[PDB]
Symmetry: C2
Subunit: 307 residues, 2 copies
């Protein structure tokens, strides 16, 4: 069987799989019965993408399609964006996914830029303006094939190819940011289907380890924290390699390549997440040159060294 492996990448060479941003730090969280069920950044160790996960950093929290209605006077988010898939192929609601790949997996305001490039009468005329997609809006229905955005600009055209490039989040009263609450992909009063399953430690003394980014925010008090279970580059690597998983848990070691020392050990689970032996919230103190290396496949009785 092809040997399993991790790419050799330091923290600042890694991208968040839940927002297009570099990883800033590693963080382990105290257990508090949190439902961790993100849909971006989900991949098995043998390379099966799950949830809404796709391969491009430029696809995370992005949308593609065309505006088909201006619903000013009916909704604050007046621009109705009929979606395609990110690669341009038509949206298919019958797919066994929770929403189009790349759809945001958090509750709050997604701040970015909506842009257009015309085809037809005035070809290659363009425009782009800051815009906000509220993932709690009644018009946030990506699994039904559309989302709406609001903008301070009214300079948008209907029936012209449109892209939404994410930039950050935004805080307003009544629109707090909850990175762990999935939006309603089919809208108000509907429940989500085809989700990647929830993730939690199942071993005493273990906590999840997150790759943490502090992303931009367009106003409001916010640390911008978005935590992912696997960096995007690891997902890209597993998709390429598709190495068979030999047990439910790959033991991995964080190493300093200059000294050769192992700094701590962790469990990398077959379903694509990391646990460490630690008690309490803790931003890890690790050298900037450090990275994880695959050690061996271990059984269900393996006790990690305290970190």
């Amino acid at each position: 069987t092809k040997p399993f492996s991790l790419p050799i990448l330091t923290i600042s060479e890694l991208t968040n799989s839940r927002f297009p941003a570099p990883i800033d730090s590693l963080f382990t969280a105290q257990n508090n019965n949190l439902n961790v069920q993100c849909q971006n950044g989900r991949c098995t160790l043998d390379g099966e993408l799950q949830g809404t996960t796709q391969l491009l950093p430029s696809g995370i929290c992005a949308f593609r399609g065309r505006l088909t209605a201006d619903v000013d006077g009916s909704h604050d988010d007046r621009w109705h964006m009929q979606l395609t898939n990110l690669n341009g192929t038509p949206f298919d609601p019958t797919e066994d996914v929770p929403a189009p790949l790349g759809t945001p997996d958090f509750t709050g305001l997604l701040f970015g830029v909506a842009s257009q490039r015309n085809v037809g009468s005035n070809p290659n005329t363009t425009r782009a303006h800051e815009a906000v997609v509220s993932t709690t809006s009644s018009q946030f229905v990506p699994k039904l094939g559309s989302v709406n955005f609001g903008s301070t600009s009214t300079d948008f055209q209907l029936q012209q190819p449109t892209k939404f490039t994410p930039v950050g989040i935004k805080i307003e009263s009544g629109h707090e940011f909850d990175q762990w609450a999935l939006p309603r992909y089919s809208g108000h009063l509907t429940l989500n289907m085809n989700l990647a399953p929830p993730i939690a430690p199942n071993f005493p003394g273990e906590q999840l380890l997150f790759f943490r980014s502090n992303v931009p925010c367009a106003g409001g008090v916010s640390d911008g924290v978005i935590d992912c279970l696997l960096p995007q580059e690891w997902i890209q690597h597993f998709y390429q390699e598709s190495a068979p998983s030999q047990s439910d848990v790959a033991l991995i070691r964080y190493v300093n390549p200059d000294t050769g020392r192992t700094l701590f050990e962790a469990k990398l689970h077959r379903t694509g997440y990391i646990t460490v032996a630690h008690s309490g919230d803790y931003p890890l103190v690790v050298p900037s040159n450090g990275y994880f290396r695959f050690d061996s496949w271990v059984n269900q009785f393996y006790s990690l060294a305290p970190m």
Copy 2:
């Protein structure tokens, strides 16, 4: 052993702008100086020019605003740069500019954002902003760039990021993707550049991975062409496979039928040529991708494509 990742066109990212690849394009030769600085990497994994590994680093800036020069420069916000990873800028590095710096002439449209430290911690703001790469204040190799914004809502001495989104066309500010900016400003010449690229065999043209990026107004196809997709650069950096000749012969394949659709030369210094005469947007199936074949001589005669 050298290899390419298995990625279709729509699974590839441009190495010169954070955007998916839209198409493949071969260009008629016309003595163009192709000397881009992002998207430069040897086949054995040596990044060159201003090339770094993150899609999020391409055409991005990080630092803090240290002056507001309102009235003296249209780009009023003076951004003292760090490296993208937060480490201090070092002007003595043998690079042309900080890694990720744009390598084209024109208006770079994006969003500048801040998150406060010290005074009013974790207050934030973000607004549309433009970096002109022809500005007298575009001096990234000296450690700073300026951006302009319609908004007045930026603060000095607070951590600032510039996230690129697209380009912008205005009178007097046409977009030229092949003209390098002056990394040290007006009246200065660039140093430490990755060398120019050109076909060196009769009948051969460069092959580009082409994106049509967003534009904030003006008539523009948004074309930004790169020599290697970002994922190939990331792959070569990981693998670091020794190059066994000057040219890797590569084959574009349809994985469903198994057929080779055309062959190309992938040069050791990180660019592709094909045997074709004239501008041509390639007509290839959406499932297709390149596969490494063998190490050949520079004078290998490609089958016409």
